[PDB]
Amino acid sequence: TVEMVFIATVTGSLSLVTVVGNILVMLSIKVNRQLQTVNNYFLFSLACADLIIGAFSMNLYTVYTIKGYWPLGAVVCDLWLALDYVVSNASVMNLLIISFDRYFCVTKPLTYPARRTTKMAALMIAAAWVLSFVLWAPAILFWQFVVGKRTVPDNQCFAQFLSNPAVTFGTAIAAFYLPVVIMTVLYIHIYLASRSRVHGIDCSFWNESYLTGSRDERKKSLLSKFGMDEGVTFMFIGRFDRGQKGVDVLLKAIEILSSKKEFQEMRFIIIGKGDPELEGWARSLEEKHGNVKVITEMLSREFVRELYGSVDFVIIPSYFEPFGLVALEAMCLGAIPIASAVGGLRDIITNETGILVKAGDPGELANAILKALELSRSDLSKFRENCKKRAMSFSQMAARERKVTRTIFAILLAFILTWTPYNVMVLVNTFCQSCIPDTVWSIGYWLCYVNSTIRPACYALCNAEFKKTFRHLLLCQ
Numbered sequence: 001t002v003e004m005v006f007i008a009t010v011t012g013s014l015s016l017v018t019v020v021g022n023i024l025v026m027l028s029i030k031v032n033r034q035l036q037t038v039n040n041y042f043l044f045s046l047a048c049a050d051l052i053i054g055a056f057s058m059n060l061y062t063v064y065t066i067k068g069y070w071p072l073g074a075v076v077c078d079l080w081l082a083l084d085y086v087v088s089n090a091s092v093m094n095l096l097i098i099s100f101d102r103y104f105c106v107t108k109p110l111t112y113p114a115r116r117t118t119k120m121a122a123l124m125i126a127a128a129w130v131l132s133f134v135l136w137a138p139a140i141l142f143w144q145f146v147v148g149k150r151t152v153p154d155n156q157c158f159a160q161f162l163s164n165p166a167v168t169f170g171t172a173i174a175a176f177y178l179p180v181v182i183m184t185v186l187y188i189h190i191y192l193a194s195r196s197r198v199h200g201i202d203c204s205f206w207n208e209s210y211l212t213g214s215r216d217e218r219k220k221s222l223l224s225k226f227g228m229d230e231g232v233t234f235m236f237i238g239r240f241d242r243g244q245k246g247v248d249v250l251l252k253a254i255e256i257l258s259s260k261k262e263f264q265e266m267r268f269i270i271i272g273k274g275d276p277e278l279e280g281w282a283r284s285l286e287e288k289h290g291n292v293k294v295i296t297e298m299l300s301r302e303f304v305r306e307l308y309g310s311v312d313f314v315i316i317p318s319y320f321e322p323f324g325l326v327a328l329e330a331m332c333l334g335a336i337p338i339a340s341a342v343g344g345l346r347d348i349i350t351n352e353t354g355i356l357v358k359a360g361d362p363g364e365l366a367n368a369i370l371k372a373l374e375l376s377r378s379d380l381s382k383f384r385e386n387c388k389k390r391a392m393s394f395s396q397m398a399a400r401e402r403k404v405t406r407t408i409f410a411i412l413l414a415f416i417l418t419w420t421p422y423n424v425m426v427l428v429n430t431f432c433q434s435c436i437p438d439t440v441w442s443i444g445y446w447l448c449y450v451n452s453t454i455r456p457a458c459y460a461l462c463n464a465e466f467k468k469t470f471r472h473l474l475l476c477q
Contacts, residue, residue, distance in 0.1 A: 004066055011062045011446075014453060018054025021456030022047040028469045035465060039404050041121040042098045043459065045129070046411075049087040049094075050452035057084050058449050065442060070157040074150065077157040078141055085136040085159065086129075088448075092179050093128035095408075095415060102405050103186045106193045165430055176423050183412050190405060200398045201325055201391075205301070206332045208388075211309040215334060215384075218310040223267065226293045231267040232376050234338070234369060235311040237304060237326070240274035240282070240296075246340070247272060249317040251281050252362035253369065258289060262373055269311065271295045308333035312380065313372050319359050321345050327354075331391035334384040338368050352383075353390040407462035414458055418451035 025047040029040045060080050064070055070077060104112040143160040144150045151160055161167045211218065220230055238245040247270065257263050270282050273296045282294040308314065314330040316339035324344030327337045331353065339345040340359035349356050355371060357364045375383070422444040428435050459466040 008062060008066055011058065011065075014450070015054055015058040015062070018050060018058065018449075018453040018456075021453060022051040022054060024470050024473050025456045025459055025466075026051065027473055028466060031473070032465070032469045035469070038116050038118055038121045039098070039101070039408075041118065042094050042101075042125060045094050045125045046091055046455060049091045050455055052083065052087045053449060053452040056080070057087075058452075061445065061449065064157065069155040072157075074152070074154070077152070080157065081159050082137050082140040085140055086132050089136055089175055090129045090132040092175055093132060094125065095412060096179050096183065097124050097128060098408050099183045099186045099412065102408050103190060105401070106190050106405070168426060169430060172423055172426055176419060180416060187409060187412065190409075194402070194405070197402075198323060200395050201328050201332070203332070203392070203395055206305065206329050208309060208333060210305060211333070215310065218306070219312070222307070222310045226269065228267060228291065228293060231265055231291065232313070232373055233267040233269065233311040234313050234315055234372070235269045235271070235307060235335070236315050236317070237271045237299075237307070238316075239298070240272045240278045242275060242278070244318060244320040245272070246317040246319045246360070247275075247278055247282070249319075249340075249360060249362050249365055250315055251278065251285065253317075253365040254285055254289075254292060256362060256366040257369060258285075260370075262370060263289075264291065265373055265376075266291055266369065268292045269295070269307070271297070271299055271307075273297050304329075305333060308335045311335055312376070313338050313369075315365070315369070316340065316345060317357075317359070317365060318342055318345065324348055328391045328395060331387040332395075334388060336372070336380070336383055336387055338365070338372055348391070348394055350390065352386045354387065403463060407458060410458045410462050411455060414454050415451055418447045418454070422448050 026044060029035050029044050029047075057080070060072075060076075063072070072080075101116075105116075139161055140159055144152075147160070151163055152158060161171070219233060223230060223233065236247065236250050238247070240247045242248060250270070254268060257266065268291060270286075270293065273279060279294075279296050282296070285292045286294045308330045312335075314326075314335040314337050316324070316326055316337055318324075318340045320342060321340070322343045324339070324347075327339060327345055327348045330337055331348070337345075337349055337354040339349060339354065339356060341356040342359050346356070355368045357368045425436050425441060425444045460470055461467075
């Protein structure tokens with residue numbers, strides 16, 4: 001009986017992993033202020049239920065397997081059945097709410113995320129747990145009372161309703177099959193809507209690491225490359241059109257400034273091609289003024305990254321701009337945006353992270369360039385740091401939302417792969433009894449328990465913030 005010690009330790013350590021893993025999930029949500037969102041309220045109840053499974057359900061099932069029979073009597077049996085049947089079904093319901101939540105998040109992105117509340121989450125979690133208890137506890141505990149006899153043998157522990165095969169499959173449909181089909185079709189739709197998505201900036205590319213030396217050094221190097229003196233550098237990048245990028249505003253704005261006493265302190269780099277009439281205008285001002293430089297071509301992002309991390313300001317005179325990645329790209333390299341108050345730009349830029357102007361007004365853009373000239377002092381370094389922080393936090397917002405949706409899919413996938421063997425065994429049992437050996441049935445039962453152990457692992461793998469704080473919690477010892 002040396003094998004008895006082996007199975008008890010393998011499963012005993014598996015019970016320990018589930019208890020450790022879910023306590024760390026629970027503790028991190030409550031301790032870490034960054035993990036206190038509406039989604040993690042539902043992930044907390046999953047860890048609550050999985051802690052119960054790992055601590056109670058697993059240890060009791062270790063007894064059943066090691067002994068070969070149920071030795072703790074009818075009282076402990078009914079309390080083990082009700083506990084297991086409520087907690088497991090609450091987790092199924094929580095997973096169902098979490099999926100519809102992700103579905104609406106993606107299908108109604110301008111209506112539903114505002115309607116999302118922390119109080120609504122708690123009301124939904126309670127509703128799931130209460131509904132599960134009202135649905136399983138009476139069926140588990142009172143079936144023997146209603147019938148008037150306990151049909152369960154003294155050596156076994158199972159729900160009395162399971163004896164009726166019509167109730168067994170009728171419950172597998174309502175508690176597994178139907179909830180899985182719903183969560184499958186909800187996710188097909190999520191994928192379809194996510195396929196047409198517009199991703200933000202590639203933060204692995206747009207960053208200061210690539211640049212060498214000091215900004216003052218790079219700016220002096222860049223200005224001498226275009227054969228120009230040291231001054232306040234203003235840069236434009238984009239298609240030379242009459243419709244949305246608006247080089248004609250900046251071109252008209254330089255003309256207003258060329259009559260001023262501040263013009264000699266300014267430096268202009270105009271990059272892009274398109275309209276030949278607008279290209280010739282840019283080329284005209286380049287000839288008239290030594291502080292104006294024009295590059296009539298669309299340059300690759302690798303050099304634009306160097307330019308953003310060298311120039312003082314970036315002028316975005318967009319007539320129409322829905323997303324404004326150009327602002328975020330420039331802000332990440334320390335460039336201060338002087339942009340039109342349109343679409344995405346209106347959202348990205350604040351009073352502390354750049355100058356906003358009225359679109360299609362060369363007079364207001366000229367005044368803004370003049371305001372930027374007065375800002376030229378030690379105050380630029382602290383302004384640049386605000387532009388970095390804002391663009392990085394803003395880009396982190398779009399990355400974390402898809403990350404949450406990716407985690408819930410991984411938890412649904414984990415759930416499907418672990419409970420399908422047992423549910424398909426139940427399906428085989430309907431027509432073929434003694435088709436499945438007792439050893440194969442036990443593998444099916446244990447896989448349902450393993451789902452509780454692999455859910456914390458899903459949070460560490462699909463979320464970087466969870467993986468880091470897990471190590472921080474074990475640090476305390």
